[PDB]
Amino acid sequence: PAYTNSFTRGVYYPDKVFRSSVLHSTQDLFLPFFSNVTWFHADNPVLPFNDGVYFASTEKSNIIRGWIFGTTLDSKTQSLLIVNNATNVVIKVCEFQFCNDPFLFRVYSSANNCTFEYVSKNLREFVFKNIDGYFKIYSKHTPIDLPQGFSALEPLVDLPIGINITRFQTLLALAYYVGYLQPRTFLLKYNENGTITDAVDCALDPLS
Amino acid sequence: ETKCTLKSFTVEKGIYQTSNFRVQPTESIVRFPNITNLCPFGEVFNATRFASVYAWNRKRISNCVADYSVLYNSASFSTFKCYGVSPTKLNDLCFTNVYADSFVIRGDEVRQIAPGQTGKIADYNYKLPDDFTGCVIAWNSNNLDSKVGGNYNYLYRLFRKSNLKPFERDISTEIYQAGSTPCNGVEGFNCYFPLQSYGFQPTYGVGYQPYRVVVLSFELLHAPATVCGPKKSTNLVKNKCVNFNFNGLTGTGVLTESNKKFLPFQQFGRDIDDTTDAVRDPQTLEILDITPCSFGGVSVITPGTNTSNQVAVLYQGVNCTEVPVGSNVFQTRAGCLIGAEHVNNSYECDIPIGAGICASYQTSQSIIAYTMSLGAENSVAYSNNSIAIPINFTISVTTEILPVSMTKTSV
Amino acid sequence: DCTMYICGDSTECSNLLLQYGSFCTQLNRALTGIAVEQDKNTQEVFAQVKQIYKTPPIKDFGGFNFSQILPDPSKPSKRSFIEDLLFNKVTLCAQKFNGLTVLPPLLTDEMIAQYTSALLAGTITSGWTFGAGAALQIPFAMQMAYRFNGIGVTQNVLYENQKLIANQFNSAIGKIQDSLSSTASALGKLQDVVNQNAQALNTLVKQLSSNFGAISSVLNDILARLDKVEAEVQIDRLITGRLQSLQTYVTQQLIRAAEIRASANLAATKMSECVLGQSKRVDFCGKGYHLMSFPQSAPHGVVFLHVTYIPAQEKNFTTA
Amino acid sequence: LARLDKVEAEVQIDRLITGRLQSLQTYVTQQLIRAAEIRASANLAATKMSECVLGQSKRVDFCGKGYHLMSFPQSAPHGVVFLHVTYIPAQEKNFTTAPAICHDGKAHFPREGVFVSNGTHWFVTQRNFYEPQIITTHNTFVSGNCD
Amino acid sequence: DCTMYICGDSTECSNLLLQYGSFCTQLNRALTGIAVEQDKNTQEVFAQV
Ligand SMILES: *[C@@H]1O[C@H](CO[C@@H]2O[C@@H](C)[C@@H](O)[C@@H](O)[C@@H]2O)[C@@H](O[C@@H]2O[C@H](CO)[C@@H](O)[C@H](O)[C@H]2NC(C)=O)[C@H](O)[C@H]1NC(C)=O
Ligand SMILES: *[C@@H]1O[C@H](CO)[C@@H](O[C@@H]2O[C@H](CO)[C@@H](O)[C@H](O)[C@H]2NC(C)=O)[C@H](O)[C@H]1NC(C)=O
Ligand SMILES: *[C@@H]1O[C@H](CO)[C@@H](O[C@@H]2O[C@H](CO)[C@@H](O)[C@H](O)[C@H]2NC(C)=O)[C@H](O)[C@H]1NC(C)=O
Ligand SMILES: *[C@@H]1O[C@H](CO)[C@@H](O[C@@H]2O[C@H](CO)[C@@H](O)[C@H](O)[C@H]2NC(C)=O)[C@H](O)[C@H]1NC(C)=O
Ligand SMILES: *[C@@H]1O[C@H](CO)[C@@H](O[C@@H]2O[C@H](CO)[C@@H](O)[C@H](O)[C@H]2NC(C)=O)[C@H](O)[C@H]1NC(C)=O
Ligand SMILES: *[C@@H]1O[C@H](CO)[C@@H](O[C@@H]2O[C@H](CO)[C@@H](O)[C@H](O)[C@H]2NC(C)=O)[C@H](O)[C@H]1NC(C)=O
Ligand SMILES: *[C@@H]1O[C@H](CO)[C@@H](O[C@@H]2O[C@H](CO)[C@@H](O)[C@H](O)[C@H]2NC(C)=O)[C@H](O)[C@H]1NC(C)=O
Ligand SMILES: *[C@@H]1O[C@H](CO)[C@@H](O[C@@H]2O[C@H](CO)[C@@H](O)[C@H](O)[C@H]2NC(C)=O)[C@H](O)[C@H]1NC(C)=O
Ligand SMILES: *[C@@H]1O[C@H](CO)[C@@H](O)[C@H](O)[C@H]1NC(C)=O
Ligand SMILES: *[C@@H]1O[C@H](CO)[C@@H](O)[C@H](O)[C@H]1NC(C)=O
Ligand SMILES: *[C@@H]1O[C@H](CO)[C@@H](O)[C@H](O)[C@H]1NC(C)=O
Ligand SMILES: *[C@@H]1O[C@H](CO)[C@@H](O)[C@H](O)[C@H]1NC(C)=O
Ligand SMILES: *[C@@H]1O[C@H](CO)[C@@H](O)[C@H](O)[C@H]1NC(C)=O
Ligand SMILES: [Zn+2]
């Protein structure tokens, strides 16, 4: 796989609390500034999840459609399936017997013991967290390698599911970047409209 | 009030802060989500077969309205401890989500189901966190979980390599090794199966009898609420000073319509100094500013009691539309001034009030309030060729008094 | 408001606070002494003039031009030009749940500007005599000639070079005007006092977010969630921590007040010795031999424009 | 101590100790601050003793209003009182004035004092007391011409 | 060093100290003002020339 500099990408709203015209120091799992993120081209290999994942895609044909998360990634344990079908975003938790090479429907051979379900030029950014019995998704779509700049990902949805995740894989329909979150203190700047316009990764360097 | 706060029957001329004004709330508002779905406690308390404590079951309770009085008012529970929450107030409070955990244990083991506990159950079966927010409910089940010849349905972990983390579960059956002798997957010396089954014969003593346990864990978070008590939501009113309770967010304030552009996921808004400053109504979804009900020091302006018993009151920083009120009213920049009479004359500052305003007892005497004079105006009559020279002189003696020491004291 | 900072709206907390007795009376009393002293400090510096002296309409001051320092009638506050610059250059009712309130000063900025105008008007129209009491008028060029005698220069040096001296003075005032417009750090001595007080209040307010060991820093949470016997144990932690936090603020404000008190006594001394007189004290009223000083008001401070004679173009001579 | 045994009494006493200790610390802290205020006032009083009583001070308003003549110290409880004696100009009168006198083309300036006209005759006088004297070659000095 | 005087090498103590909030920032800031002022005091006396 290739590699690229993440620059100031990957900031998200840490809490569902409106704040404006204020600088707030928050401590949470954030993608470190200028982090060395992995780069792939459409590639659907299985990747570790660690403490959390930053995922972004540069696209013009909507080829990337979903993700699968778990540990064994087979029917021996529950696993989370996220899939953006042609009409709805769909989310399911089940003991999916995932295929050796999932694609779009040929994602799994069989499924059982399901316990959660939910149904709803372009740079698409996503952040996935799995903390304290919640799976949390943040995202933003930006009109446009990973471009240098700053914008904050808003919470898309969260799942009150207690599942265990250690690795994940991407689902494609017949280029993207992956980064890992780390516990970092970020000083966030909120404008008068209450949107984050700048941030300082306090551990980056002495000036920060 | 001055005499009382000075603890003196006589008062010298001056301005004395005696107390603090506060606009008391007109009425109390309660606003919970309009959810009618009753929380399904029945299926966790009245399940036929409970889980083995080594494999303790968990169920999420959410998007429902609870009534914990149904539980706490029942006499059948032998133990109903709560941590970080009180069993009575539990019905007035509201939560984001709740986890109900259940298992069967010996009566002697109920004491281990508490935060900070240790022992076989606490260390290797069900560990509570140090800052546990829930309630532990337990009752004797020797009428259901025991039988003649003993019931061996239930199991507990007797051996483990390390202590469990809070709310961790381990259903592994690998034979434990207690010494240097390898076990190779079979029991023997220093090699023991990690699970054991209780001797639930019905004739056993209470400490050995089976007990059913349900543990409720409450997720108090900034996230939106989904499990509120049975409180009926009141009507919503604005601009009045009122008490409020939004999904548990309790306080007093002047609810005002907000132009703050909350994003659709946001539920609360905060001050520069992180105090709660705005809130989303859980039914209308409108955004409300929470301005504090106004307050201010109450200063009493008085000549000496040896001069007069008449006094004026300054409500510092308070606006005269807010005070409840001997009936002269004057909005100084220092605050609403009451009982003092405004005049257009100017005099030397007798009693200082602030922002250039002073007060004095003057004529029919009354406490007047006026803009202070800085001194007499005087044009010096300067010209490019005129000088003034004193024809005479005054020898003046001026007393200056200076503190030099203070009373030497020791404790 | 000690009881509101510590307990807010809670009567349950207010009753617990009574167990600590006099501490809230002491804190309010200490802050009141500091506040009352701020008016004393201002009165001691500016209220030195007995009468509000007014300048003549015809400013025939021997060629010396005080237009930048005398009042501008067009300004709503009737401040001078330099005073308006000073007020513009310093850059920073109660609606706060934490009980914090800012009291207004006794003398408004307009009154302080009126005192500095009286001090300045008296100085140029009567010299040092308004300090002694009589405010004897004297032509400005002649009182400047006495200032020369005071520094040990013969008075003929003033009259023979009056045009040059006036041109030098007018140019120096212009340099001040340009300097205060262009510079930033010059008023840092006043800005530091604002920054110290602001930072001390932000510290006091942020301490309300701390738990001090309680289950929550928000006192309404504890009362909404725990019964009296358990709530009082948790509230006593917040009370103890908040009380200590407020004591730390009041203690350091008493120390800062003593620093300002010393600076106010100094400013009052310079008003008397540099403005109402001519001072023989070396470096008390600027560098060089002191001629006269003009006071200008600033936000929570005073600016002295010290005018001094500085020897130049020294030449070697044999002496005996 | 009369009502609780050692293990329980010590828990209750530790509260009194903590509160009383904090109460006493608050007193000592504020006394240190007050002592510094008195110290400054004592240094000032000591300065006025030296400069106003043991001498004559040219410092304006240091030793009362007006021109300082002398001061007399008087003791007071925990303090000192200075009776400052000063000269205050009175009954000021307007006079026409000139910076120099032109004579035979020479410009004359006062050695000490100021030139004043009673309306018709020019005199020289001291600045702080009207005592007019004839303008003479002795009480004035020459410098340059009249232009 | 306020956190080292109070807690030394202990991370367990350091996390408890956070519950007291700003006190260690205030103490370090106060001592820094005193230290910076000592250089001002020396400059004011001797750097007059
Ligand atoms: C000094 O005189 C002025 C007035 O000048 C007058 O005309 C001169 C040519 C000369 O003859 C002076 O002696 C005359 O007195 C006085 O100023 C006026 O005072 C009155 C009150 O007494 C006041 O109403 C006027 O407005 C003043 N005029 C100005 C221009 O201010 C001044 O009081 C005299 N001073 C003394 C000490 O006698
Ligand atoms: C999630 O499940 C994985 C297993 O799929 C757990 O990983 C094991 O953790 C133990 C320590 O607890 C190690 O000894 C094993 O080697 C791990 N196995 C693998 C395959 O990595 C993991 O601990 C679980 N996480 C949680 C939070 O329960
Ligand atoms: C995308 O997935 C959704 C389910 O999440 C599908 O929606 C269902 O469609 C069938 C008809 O095919 C309906 O009977 C169901 O009621 C629908 N369910 C919901 C929740 O809407 C949808 O058809 C899928 N789209 C595609 C193109 O496959
Ligand atoms: C779904 O999960 C349950 C466990 O929760 C599985 O039930 C176990 O099945 C095995 C046989 O495969 C039995 O030996 C266990 O006794 C069962 N446990 C319980 C609690 O019933 C079940 O097999 C799973 N189903 C599928 C299709 O995977
Ligand atoms: C005190 O509060 C009242 C409101 O209760 C203020 O009155 C308003 O003043 C504005 C002008 O500033 C008017 O347009 C409104 O119509 C007034 N409202 C009412 C109900 O009279 C008043 O200005 C405040 N006073 C001060 C000094 O702030
Ligand atoms: C100088 O001032 C004194 C007052 O301090 C004047 O003395 C008074 O003079 C009148 C007569 O004009 C007497 O009736 C008073 O009894 C005197 N008082 C005192 C205390 O002696 C004195 O006249 C003034 N001198 C001039 C030249 O004006
Ligand atoms: C006194 O000083 C002011 C400047 O502070 C002079 O005012 C300027 O005068 C010129 C004309 O000579 C104008 O072009 C400027 O616009 C004026 N500036 C301001 C700020 O008004 C004034 O002329 C000086 N007076 C004398 C007699 O020298
Ligand atoms: C101005 O001063 C002269 C003195 O230099 C005064 O002249 C004297 O006036 C008196 C009468 O008042 C005569 O007896 C003297 O002979 C005059 N002396 C001379 C030398 O002429 C004059 O009166 C004064 N004028 C005013 C208005 O005070
Ligand atoms: C990014 O990390 C990889 C190792 O994972 C390394 O080989 C590569 O050189 C790094 N690139 C940069 C730009 O640091
Ligand atoms: C369990 O069933 C009994 C009736 O048999 C009922 O009274 C009780 O409320 C049920 N439990 C709960 C938690 O509702
Ligand atoms: C709750 O009440 C509001 C009206 O105040 C209504 O619009 C809303 O639909 C109700 N909630 C639900 C889930 O229907
Ligand atoms: C009260 O005032 C009278 C004069 O009206 C005076 O004689 C008396 O001494 C005063 N008493 C006190 C205690 O001030
Ligand atoms: C006092 O002055 C104001 C103008 O500032 C005027 O409106 C008011 O009528 C005056 N009142 C009296 C009693 O003279
Ligand atoms: Zn001689």
Residue numbers in the entry:
A (entry chain A): 26 to 67, 80 to 141, 157 to 172, 187 to 210, 215 to 244, 264 to 297
B (entry chain C): 298 to 622, 639 to 676, 689 to 736
C (entry chain A): 737 to 828, 851 to 1078
D (entry chain C): 981 to 1127
E (entry chain B): 737 to 785
Authors' text:
S glycoprotein trimers protrude out from the viral membrane and are the major proteins on the viral surface, making it the main target for vaccine design. Sequential cleavage of S at the S1/S2 site followed by the S2’ site within the S2 domain exposes the fusion peptide (FP), which mediates host-viral membrane fusion, allowing entry of the viral genome into the host cell. Overall, the S-trimer structures are similar to those previously determined for B.1 in situ, and are similar across all variants.
Our quantitative Cα RMSD analysis identifies particularly large structural differences between Alpha and B.1. The major differences are around the A570D mutation, in the 630 loop (residues 617–644), and in the FPPR (residues 823–853). First, residues 852–855 (chain B) which form the end of the final α-helix in the FPPR, instead adopt a β-strand conformation, folding down and packing against residues 858–861 (β-strand). The 570 hairpin has moved ~5 Å outwards such that K854 faces D570 at the A570D variant (Alpha) position. The 630 loop is largely disordered. In the Alpha variant, a plausible model is that the A570D mutation stabilizes an interaction between the rotated K854 and the “intermediate-position” 570 hairpin, thereby allowing these transitions to happen already in the closed conformation of the S prior to RBD opening. The Alpha variant has an aspartate to histidine mutation at residue 1118 (D1118H). When modeling H1118 upwards away from the membrane, the three histidine residues coordinate an ion, which based on coordination geometry is likely to be Zn2+, directly on the threefold symmetry axis. In summary, the H1118 mutation (Alpha) permits a stabilizing interaction (i.e., ion coordination) in the closed conformation that the D1118 (B.1) cannot make.
